[PDB]
Amino acid sequence: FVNRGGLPVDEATWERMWKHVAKIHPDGEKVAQRIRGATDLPKIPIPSVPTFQPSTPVPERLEAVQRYIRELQYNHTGTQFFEIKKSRPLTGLMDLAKEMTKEALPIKALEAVILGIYLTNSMPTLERFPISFKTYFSGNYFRHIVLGVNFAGRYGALGMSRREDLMYKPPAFRTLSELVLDFEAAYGRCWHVLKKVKLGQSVSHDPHSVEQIEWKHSVLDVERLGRDDFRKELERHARDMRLK
């Protein structure tokens, strides 16, 4: 379920969220009874958007950006509070990123990618590009996405995930293949087969850009490629970005 009428959440989207909780949680109705209209709920602090001294190295800034993203918390409610239309102009998506920082609600992988671009537009020596995954577990397909980053010729990632090892990577990987193979290993450890990796182009640092994000500049079928060709195609995508 996706909130499609912005904030505050309209009456219909709100009931739907609480209907969904009623079916998913064993005590679903008791959860709604305890929370809905409760006058003794914790006040959640609005997390502070991190701002950076020009003396702070980019890797340290990325740590603060990831901490901010984590502080919003992974959205387990079953209702996404922000609609992300992936084909929208960057300027529209960065308007959404700003509203995410002002309203400060839980988020999932795609929202974290938009936030990551927004909070690193101040870092022109950092290149940002989305990396999407399609995985298989127990007869079902799963989709995930992170923000690949490149600083000083080394690859890292920002993002939001259920699992610690499927989001943040410090920019220490010497090649793009070493970064993506670390994700593939993490998936292998939680018994997922990696089927496809989709790699985007460098995103503009201009938050008023009318350009779209290119999400699928490279689509790599891991199984059809095999080990060697998969590394070659990842390295080819790394060169394409460095030269453009």
């Binding site: 505050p8 709100w14 929370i35 006040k43 387990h76």
Partner: peptide, 28 residues
């Protein structure tokens, strides 16, 4: 503001809910 009070009330219920559902998903 009525709209602000509404977002504050909703935000507090969203995080109380998110804690409960995080604890649920934590015990698959």
């Amino acid at each position: 503001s009525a709209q602000q009070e509404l977002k504050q009330r909703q935000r507090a219920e969203i995080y109380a809910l998110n804690r409960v559902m995080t604890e649920l998903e934590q015990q698959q």
